[PDB]
Structures are given as structure tokens and as C-alpha cells.
RNA sequence: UGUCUAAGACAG
RNA sequence: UGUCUAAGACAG
């Protein structure tokens, strides 16, 4: 009914939460930015398009700042040393119903649920073993 | 320990739960598949490589199938009507701390959290607006 | 004395037991087939030939059918939706004594023993990890 | 979780027991070797590749050495007088469910069970008759 | 029986010890990382392969961070100024028994034993004299 | 002082001890050999060079022989059945402090310490798993 | 860098 | 990077 609203990106349970809010809608690409310099902000963008006759495709991008030893509002170079990039590409066949889509979402939440292999590997600077 | 363990990918409160298990590590690609025929299984893969001299890149893939029974040559075979594909790439600088990495994980979780814009949009078969 | 006899290929207690019986032994190839429709039968063949001047080569083959009914034009025939094919070759130097051979057999048995890597990987539609 | 572990290849009660341990797993090929002189070790390798679009192919290999000492020039080296070579290929359609696979495994186990035709023929330096 | 466990890499007798723990097993290459940013971590990797018909070869790599004036979690460039690299290549003929191998290990420990020329030379930024 | 002294390479508690002594420094390569015939001796070599404008590189080599008596031309000669080769290269930045270097040494010692994964694996003729 | 018959050869 | 019949193909 209008989902383009701000939300909590990083939840630290009230104390030090990171909120990200609508900052751009140019070309139908929703963008959320955190309240920072663009170089240190948390950024989220999302868009959908029918990639092919059979599929629709969501493209979600997230940018997360390196915070340890960060100097707020400072000029930190090289940019590549201070930022992590997440590029998510979700492909859904045009036959998927809302239910099918809810399932897909659940699978994504499950993939990243706290305690599961993938997130704990990433959280620990590790691979699988 | 060993983080290469099975985990529940789709949670439907104990019943109807899609759990996925380690199934392969050949060629440095950790694989987990659901307990079905290979033709109908859910599949999750992960791999980390040192992409740049100063970056590490995780490549994660999830395959959500739409199971069906096809009648090929007058014989029924377990198959997939179609598949939904999640393909994500994460680039983290080598300067990232475990705390810096935890931040990335929390952000990804918050991104897909129930009720937030993106999963809402996806589950409703719509864009952000 | 004869070893070209009937034997249990698949052991399901005393019930579902799959038995295979001698069918033919032409051209040095012993063939065993389970009962009922040849089209849905299990097949096992074995032969030993003196490959080189120092080696004897065994060639064991097993076919596991996926029993199904095929309807076409309203006509149904008992068929095999597909078959799983096992093809093994065992080479043993002519210097192997009967003890040496028993050892080779125990090695083959151990390889497939319940709970060991290979059989469990196979049983679970998986690879090694 | 991991199935790439140590296991008993030859079972001589609790004594002469031949154990094989993970040695290497490069290029999708899992290798296991028994201890002591590599020159007299038992070898087991396994790999699964998606052969056709409908089949996955397993390739299991086992080497049984005939332990001996080789004296030459008065210099003795632990060697293998010769080796027995087992090379098996198992093809399984992607339609096989976990049950289908367990059956295939039980079939392989039955084929080599003590007292059945093939294993006894082999064990006795014989063929079928 | 499973040697891929964490261990103490730098022993300072309890007070300030550096522990390194399993972090990756992609392609059979065991990797241990210390609890740091990947750029400041202590890293250890190990693998074996039969380099030739006659020899097996262990390849051990160690990475040690420059600690003096280090800024924990900071971005320190150039990478080459803050890291030491150890590349160990151990070649063992396939005739070596476990005893032969134990000897080889002892020789390595002896080479680096506290008080011996090589380590004291390295520890003092010196050569031999 | 002079760090170019003899030291015990293989320690077997005073008896059976392989001690190695300075034997050459020609061309900047410090050499130590055990007290045997050159054909059967243990050999340790070391050299440091300023590899880069900002690195120093140590190159260390150890040769562990398998002594034997060969009968060449009807005459017995002291020889080596084979040799095991340890070849290691260490690169330390010029910015490394003596304390930074001590760290490197301690890490190498901890690496090869009795009971830790790597020496365990080596001595057992296996990989890490 | 990777291999070896190993301070010297080999292969990129 | 972008697409797909998806750890492997395609297109810059």
C-alpha cells in the first residue's frame, strides 16, 4: 500500500540501531540511506524488472561501512578498504503466486538466520569447514 | 567445530519445514541439498575466494524449486515445474574485523526481516513505491 | 557344486527381498535376472577374462530398475521409468593367493559397509564433504 | 559435519584392521590412504560428476597392495610386489530419491555379501560355474 | 583421528597467547586463522599431494603480522610492510615409514629450537656470522 | 659472538642425537652438515638476501637422508637410499622490529610443536581432516 | 611461482 | 557486469 518507508537495517535492540530511510526514487530504483556522509552511509537499493519472458528479477544492493577505527565524517581512502558490497539478484518465474513468493522469502530469511552456517561463516571471517 | 552442518532453510514451525544438509564440498564449493531427488531438491551453495589482493568475495546461491510430477513418455517422473534463483555476492575488505563482519550479517538479516519493505514487496509480487 | 545360482540381491528382511536367478551363461557371461516382467527386472552379470599375461579381470554389472507403469494410447505396459547402472572392473594379478583374494573381497565389503563415507554419500544423493 | 573421514577398509576383527584416512581432496577427487610407507599403502578415491543432464556418475577406485621388501644392490625399500585394482562406476538418474539410492546401496552390499556367487568366486581365485 | 582442530600458534605461556582455529577447508587445504581482521590475522594453511611418482609433498604456509605500532582493526597500507610470509615445502619419498616421518619432524623442531643459530639469527634481524 | 655454531638437529635424548656443524660459508650460504660422509650427511643451509627494496628473505634448507650401503660394481659404498627435503623461504619487511621477528620465530615453533595438527599429520603419513 | 636426481638444474 | 535451461554455459 506504499512500502517505500524507512526501516531498521541493523538492529541492536534500541541502543545504537541503524535506521535507513528513503533517499531516492530516480528511475524507479528505491534507495535508502543511513544518516551519514554518503561515503560512510549504509545504503540499500532495490528494483524489479522482467528480465526475460519467463522471469521477473529483483536486484537488491546493500553497502555496509567498515566501522572499526572509522573516523566519523572523515575522509577515508581508499574507498575499497572501508566498504563491503552486497549484490543480490533474485529471479522468480512469472508462474509464482504470492504464496510461492512468501516461501522464497522464508528461504532467504532461513539462509541468514542467526546461528546457521553461512552467516556464522561470514561473521567469523571464515569459509566452510 | 565445523560450520558445515545442516540447517533449516524454510521454517514452517516444525511441520513442513524444509531442512537442507551438507552434500558436497568438491572443488571448494560447499553444497547443501534438501532431502529429495536431485531433480526436485532445494540447493544451497557457498564459496569464498580472495578476489582482489585486498578483498574476499563470498558467492552464495539458493535454488527454490516448484515440485511437480511430469508424465514423460507415458511415465511419471518427479521433477520441478520451475526454479527460483537467489544469487548473491558479498565483497568484504581484508581490513574488516569480526565485529565489522557481524555488522554486515545483521544488516542482511534486517534487510529481509518480516514486515520491512523489500520482503513485503517480493511476497506481494510488486515493486517498491 | 555350482555358484551360478539364485541369491538375494536386495535384502529387505524377509519381505520385500529382491532375488535374482540364473538366466543365461553364454559367451563366458553369467547373467542373473529377478522374476516377473523382464522389463522391470533387476540384472546382474559377471565375467572373468585373462586381460594381460599377469592379470585376470572381473567385470561385474548391476542394473537397478525404477519400476513404473507406462500408459500410452490407453495401453499400459510394465516398464522401468529408468535404471541405475553399476559397472565395476576388478583386476587381480595371477600371483594373488586365495588369502590375497579374500582380503580384496573384505576391502570391497568394507568400502560399502553401512555408515562408511561412500555408501552414505550415495544413499543421501550426495558427494563427499 | 563431514563424511570425508577415516574409516576401516579391511576389517580383521580389531587386530590386523586396515584403516584408511583422508589424504587429499583436490579437483573434486577425495583420496584416502592407509598409514606408513605411501609405497605400501592402500588407496581409495571417490568422485561424483554430473555426467549427462539426467545422470550423476560416481567413480570409486580402490588399490590393494601386496606388501613386500625389495632388495637391490643390498639396499632395501618397502614396496608393493603388485597391486590389485578395483575401478567402479555407478550411474544414478537425478530422479532417484533418497530411498531409491538406499536400495542401490543395499544392492551393492548384497552383491558382495559373504557366501554369494561373485565374492566367493573372487575369493577362491575362480570364475562362475 | 581428526587433526583439524585449533591450536596455540604463539605461546606466551597463557598471558597473551595466540590461538589459531579452523577457518576453511576448500579444496582440501586446511586453513587456520587467528581472531582478527583478515589483514592482521595470523594465518596457517596446509596441504599434501603426491608431487611426483616418487614423492609426496606437504605445502605449509604461515602469515605473521607486524605488531609493533599496529593499530588494531585499522587499515594499514601497504600490506607488504605489515606482513611476514613463510612458505614451507616438505618433500617426502613414498618409502618413508611413520618412523622415518617422525624423524623428519624432529629435525624440523630441532632446526627451530630456541637457542639454535637459525632462529636466533631471524629473531635478531641477522644473518650468520 | 658468532651464531655460526653447531647445534643438535635431531634430539633423541643424548643418545642417537643427530648433531650438525658449520662446514661452509662460501658464497654467502651458511652450511652445516652432520658428521658423516658427504654422501650420507644431514645438511642444513641458510642465506639472507635483501629480496626487495623493503623486504629481506631468508632461504633455509634441510636434507634428511635415509642411509644405506649400496653394492655398486661388487663394492660396498656408504650412500643414501633417498633424501627428504625441507625447503623454506621467509620474507620479513624491513619495518619489522626484533620483537616483531621474535613473534615470527615463536609462531614457527608453535607450528611444529608436538601434538599440534601439522606435525601430527606429517608423522602419521596423512593429511589434515 | 610450480617440479627435481637439490645453493643447481627444469618448466611459467 | 548484464541474461539463463544455473558452481556452467551466454552476451561486454
Task: State the DSSP string of F42-110.
Answer: -EEEEEEE--SSSEEEEEEEEEEEEEEEEEETTEEEEEEEEEEEEEEEEEEETT--HHHHHHHHHHHHH
B29, B46 in Cβ contact below 8 A?
A: yes
- Reference D51, options D108, D89, D99, D87; nearest CA is D89
CA C58, CA B100: separation in Å to the nearest integer?
Answer: 60
F60 touches strand G (CB under 7 A): yes
A121 CA to H1 C1' distance (Å): 26
Hey, of D28, D82, D110, which one would you mutate to test binding to chain C, going by the most C CBs within 10 A of its CB?
Answer: D110
Burial letters for D14-43: b for 16+ Cβ neighbours within 10 Å, e otherwise? eeeebbbbbbbbbebbbbbbbbbbbbbbbb
F128, F118 in Cβ contact below 8 A?
A: yes
Distance of CA B95 to the CA centre of its chain: 26
| Physical contact, C and F (3 or more Cβ pairs within 8 A) | no
User: Which residue of chain A has the CA closest to B21?
Assistant: A117
E87 touches strand G (CB under 7 A): yes
C81 CA to G9 C1' distance (Å): 61
Of the partner residues B25, B29, B94, the one whose CB lies closest to the CB of residue E39 = B94
E33 CA to H1 C1' distance (Å): 32
CA dihedral E87, E88, E91, E92 (to 10 degrees): -150
- Reference C52, options C81, C100, C93; nearest CA is C93
Which CATH class name applies to D1-129?
alpha beta
The 3-class secondary structure across chain B, one letter per residue, is CCCCCCEEEECCCCCCCEEEEEEECHHHCEEEEECCCCCCCCEEEEEEECCCCCEEEEEEEEEEEEEEEEEECCEEEEEEEEEEEEEEEEEEECCCCHHHHHHHHHHHHHHHCCCCHHHHHHHCCCCCC
CA A59, CA C31: separation in Å to the nearest integer?
Answer: 58
CA C60, CA C83: separation in Å to the nearest integer?
Answer: 16
3-class SS at A51? coil
Name residue A26's beta-bridge partners: none
The neighbour count for residue E71, using CB atoms within 10 Å, is 10
Contact D26 E49 (CB under 8 A): yes
C21, C34 in Cβ contact below 8 A?
A: yes
Kindly report whether the peptide bond that precedes residue D18 is cis, defined as omega within 30 degrees of 0: no
Cα–Cα distances in angstroms (integers) from residue C102 to residues C56, C63, D110, D119, in the given order: 15, 25, 16, 8
Cα–Cα distances in angstroms (integers) from residue E104 to residues C102, C115, E98, F66, in the given order: 36, 36, 10, 10
CA D84, CA D25: separation in Å to the nearest integer?
Answer: 23
C101, D122 in Cβ contact below 8 A?
A: yes
The 3-class secondary structure across chain C, one letter per residue, is CCCCCCEEEECCCCCCCEEEEEEECCCCCEEEEECCCHHHCCEEEECEECCCCCEEEEEEEEEEEEEEEEEECCEEEEEEEEEEEEEEEEEEECCCCHHHHHHHHHHHHHHHCCCCHHHHHHHCCCCCC
Distance of CA A91 to the CA centre of its chain: 16
How many CA within 13 A on the CB side of residue C129?
28
CA F92, CA F105: separation in Å to the nearest integer?
Answer: 11
C112, D11 in Cβ contact below 8 A?
A: no
E51 touches strand G (CB under 7 A): yes
Name residue D20's beta-bridge partners: D7, D34
User: Which residue of chain C has the CA closest to B40?
Assistant: C125
Name residue B57's beta-bridge partners: B49, B91
Read off the C-alpha cell for F24: 661452509
Who contacts C88 (Cβ-Cβ below 8 Å, separation ≥6)?
C58, C59, C60, C61, D86, D87, D88, D89
Asked if B91 is an interface residue toward chain D (Cβ–Cβ < 8 A), one would say no
- Containing H/E element for D87? strand D75-93
CA A115, CA A113: separation in Å to the nearest integer?
Answer: 6
Distance of CA A87 to the CA centre of its chain: 8
- Reference F90, options D96, E87, D31, D22; nearest CA is E87
Q: Is E41 left (phi over 0), alpha (psi -120 to 50) or beta?
A: beta
Asked if B26 is an interface residue toward chain D (Cβ–Cβ < 8 A), one would say yes
D45, D31 in Cβ contact below 8 A?
A: yes
CA A83, CA A67: separation in Å to the nearest integer?
Answer: 9
Distance of CA B88 to the CA centre of its chain: 9
E51 CA to G10 C1' distance (Å): 15
CA D117, CA A72: separation in Å to the nearest integer?
Answer: 78
CA C93, CA C98: separation in Å to the nearest integer?
Answer: 12
D117, C46 in Cβ contact below 8 A?
A: yes
C116 CA to G3 C1' distance (Å): 36
In the block, residue with C-alpha cell 595438527: F117
Q: Which nucleotide is nearest to B59 (CA to C1')?
A: H7
Contacts D73 to F, Cβ<8 Å: 70-72
> F120 — phi, psi (to 5°)?
-60, -55
User: Which residue of chain B has the CA closest to C127?
Assistant: B24
E118 CA to G9 C1' distance (Å): 27
CA A76, CA A83: separation in Å to the nearest integer?
Answer: 10
The neighbour count for residue E127, using CB atoms within 10 Å, is 17
Cα–Cα distances in angstroms (integers) from residue C66 to residues B76, C20, C72, E10, in the given order: 11, 16, 18, 58
CA F14, CA F106: separation in Å to the nearest integer?
Answer: 25
CA B55, CA B96: separation in Å to the nearest integer?
Answer: 10
Who contacts B21 (Cβ-Cβ below 8 Å, separation ≥6)?
B6, B32, B33, B34, B35, C124, C126, D1
How many CA within 13 A on the CB side of residue A122?
31
E106 CA to G6 C1' distance (Å): 21
Burial letters for C74-96: b for 16+ Cβ neighbours within 10 Å, e otherwise? eeeeebbbbbbbbebebbbbeeb
Asked if B95 is an interface residue toward chain E (Cβ–Cβ < 8 A), one would say yes
Nearest residue: Cα versus C1' of G1: E87
- Containing H/E element for E47? strand E43-49
A59, A46 in Cβ contact below 8 A?
A: yes
In the block, residue with C-alpha cell 611418482: E53
DSSP at E21:
E
CA E19, CA E23: separation in Å to the nearest integer?
Answer: 12
Contact A125 E75 (CB under 8 A): no
B59 CA to H8 C1' distance (Å): 15
Query: CA of D41 to nearest chain B CA: how many angstroms apart?
Result: 24
Hey, of E6, E19, E75, which one would you mutate to test binding to chain A, going by the most A CBs within 10 A of its CB?
Answer: E75
| Chains near C (3 or more Cβ pairs under 8 Å) | B, D
CA A123, CA B90: separation in Å to the nearest integer?
Answer: 12
| Chains near F (3 or more Cβ pairs under 8 Å) | D, E
Q: Going by DSSP bridges, is the β-strand pair C55-72/C75-93 parallel, antiparallel, or unpaired?
A: antiparallel
First to last CA, chain B: 45
CA D81, CA D68: separation in Å to the nearest integer?
Answer: 5
In the block, residue with C-alpha cell 552442518: B5
Hey, of B1, B29, B37, B45, which one would you mutate to test binding to chain D, going by the most D CBs within 10 A of its CB?
Answer: B37
F114, F122 in Cβ contact below 8 A?
A: no
- Reference A105, options F51, D80, B64; nearest CA is B64
| Residues listed for chain F | 129
Please, what sign has the CA dihedral across residues B48, B52, B53, B54? negative
What positions of strand H are covered by protein, i.e. any atom < 7 Å from a CB? Answer: 1-8
Cα–Cα distances in angstroms (integers) from residue E69 to residues D53, E81, E123, in the given order: 57, 12, 18
Contact D125 C66 (CB under 8 A): no
- Reference D99, options F50, C66, A83, A7; nearest CA is C66
Contact E49 D6 (CB under 8 A): no
How many CA within 13 A on the CB side of residue F58?
30
F59 touches strand G (CB under 7 A): yes
The 3-class secondary structure across D21-84, one letter per residue, is EEEECCCCCEEEEECCCHHHCCEEEECEECCCCCEEEEEEEEEEEEEEEEEECCEEEEEEEEEE
3-class SS at D13? coil
- Containing H/E element for E41? none
Kindly report whether the peptide bond that precedes residue B118 is cis, defined as omega within 30 degrees of 0: no
Resolution (A): 3.0
Hey, of B97, B100, B103, B104, which one would you mutate to test binding to chain E, going by the most E CBs within 10 A of its CB?
Answer: B97
Sheet holding B75-93, edge to edge: A7-10, A18-24, A30-34, A43-49, A55-65, A83-93, B75-93, B55-72, B43-49, B30-34, B18-24, B7-10
Query: CA of B114 to nearest chain D CA: how many angstroms apart?
Result: 30
The neighbour count for residue E23, using CB atoms within 10 Å, is 26
Contacts D28 to E, Cβ<8 Å: none
Contact D2 B24 (CB under 8 A): no
Distance of CA A81 to the CA centre of its chain: 19
DSSP at A12:
S
CA C28, CA B19: separation in Å to the nearest integer?
Answer: 49
DSSP at A114:
T
Experimental technique, in short, is: X-ray
| Physical contact, D and C (3 or more Cβ pairs within 8 A) | yes
Amino acid at each position: 500500500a506504499s512500502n517505500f518507508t524507512q526501516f531498521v537495517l541493523v538492529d541492536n535492540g534500541g541502543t545504537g540501531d541503524v535506521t535507513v530511510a528513503p533517499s531516492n526514487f530516480a528511475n524507479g530504483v528505491a534507495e535508502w540511506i543511513s544518516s551519514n556522509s554518503r561515503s560512510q552511509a549504509y545504503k540499500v537499493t532495490c528494483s524489479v524488472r522482467q528480465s526475460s519472458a519467463q522471469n521477473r528479477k529483483y536486484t537488491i544492493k546493500v553497502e555496509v561501512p567498515k566501522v572499526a577505527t572509522q573516523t566519523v565524517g572523515g575522509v577515508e581512502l581508499p574507498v575499497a578498504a572501508w566498504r563491503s558490497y552486497l549484490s543480490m539478484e533474485l529471479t522468480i518465474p512469472i508462474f509464482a503466486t504470492n504464496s510461492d513468493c512468501e516461501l522464497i522469502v522464508k528461504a532467504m530469511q532461513g539462509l541468514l538466520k542467526d546461528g546457521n552456517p553461512i552467516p556464522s561463516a561470514i561473521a567469523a571471517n571464515s569459509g566452510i569447514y
